[PDB]
Amino acid sequence: XXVXXXXXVXXFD
């Protein structure tokens, strides 16, 4: 997993 633009489970906008 990690940080940036993409898809899965976590915190994003």
- Residues at the contact surface with a second copy, assessed by CB under 8 A: 1-13
13: three-class secondary structure by DSSP? coil
Query: Closest distance between a second copy and the C-beta of residue 9, in Å?
Result: 5
Query: Closest distance between a second copy and the C-beta of residue 6, in Å?
Result: 6
Query: Closest distance between a second copy and the C-beta of residue 5, in Å?
Result: 5
Q: Which residues contact 10 (CB under 8 A, 6 or more apart)?
A: 1
How far is the CA of 9 from the CAs of 4, 12, in angstroms?
A: 13, 9
